[PDB]
Amino acid sequence: MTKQEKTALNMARFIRSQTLTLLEKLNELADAADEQADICESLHDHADELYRSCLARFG
Amino acid sequence: MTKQEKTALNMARFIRSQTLTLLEKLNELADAADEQADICESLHDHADELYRSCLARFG
């Protein structure tokens, strides 16, 4: 991979992990963050899809 | 807002900014990251929607 590709891939990994952490936090807030947790569940799946796509293309 | 809500809101802001940075990086790679940039454009819009939702609910 190029160095520029590696930066992007590392950032995609980081975003996937951050979105999981946020999902956990929103889930822990229960009813007080219910709709937000549902949006974040989708967000995390989308971050995972991006990471996988980068890995397959660059790697 | 609660302190737990503030943590979540701050994290949602951070993720929105990180996804924009990644989008810029993927766009700069042009054809070499085209599909990934298209996924990331959607990802950033979804992060913006999450942030806005948290802000309106917690704030």
Side-chain angles (χ1 to χ4, degrees):
Chain A
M1 90 188 53
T2 73
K3 305 326 213 291
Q4 289 166 91
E5 287 165 352
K6 175 176 61 179
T7 298
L9 181 63
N10 293 339
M11 200 167 348
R13 188 181 299 109
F14 178 67
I15 291 166
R16 181 177 83 167
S17 179
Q18 292 284 287
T19 65
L20 186 59
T21 299
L22 180 56
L23 180 53
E24 293 170 353
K25 290 182 176 307
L26 294 168
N27 284 345
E28 280 150 49
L29 291 169
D31 67 292
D34 57 2
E35 184 180 356
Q36 294 68 42
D38 289 333
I39 296 165
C40 196
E41 180 166 27
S42 181
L43 184 68
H44 174 66
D45 288 351
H46 209 326
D48 183 61
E49 182 188 24
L50 178 60
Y51 175 66
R52 293 188 195 194
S53 185
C54 292
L55 184 60
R57 195 171 191 185
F58 306 154
Chain B
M1 90 188 53
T2 73
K3 305 326 213 291
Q4 289 166 91
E5 287 165 352
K6 175 176 61 179
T7 298
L9 181 63
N10 293 339
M11 200 167 348
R13 188 181 299 109
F14 178 67
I15 291 166
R16 181 177 83 167
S17 179
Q18 292 284 287
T19 65
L20 186 59
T21 299
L22 180 56
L23 180 53
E24 293 170 353
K25 290 182 176 307
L26 294 168
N27 284 345
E28 280 150 49
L29 291 169
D31 67 292
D34 57 2
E35 184 180 356
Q36 294 68 42
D38 289 333
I39 296 165
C40 196
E41 180 166 27
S42 181
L43 184 68
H44 174 66
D45 288 351
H46 209 326
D48 183 61
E49 182 188 24
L50 178 60
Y51 175 66
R52 293 188 195 194
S53 185
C54 292
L55 184 60
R57 195 171 191 185
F58 306 154

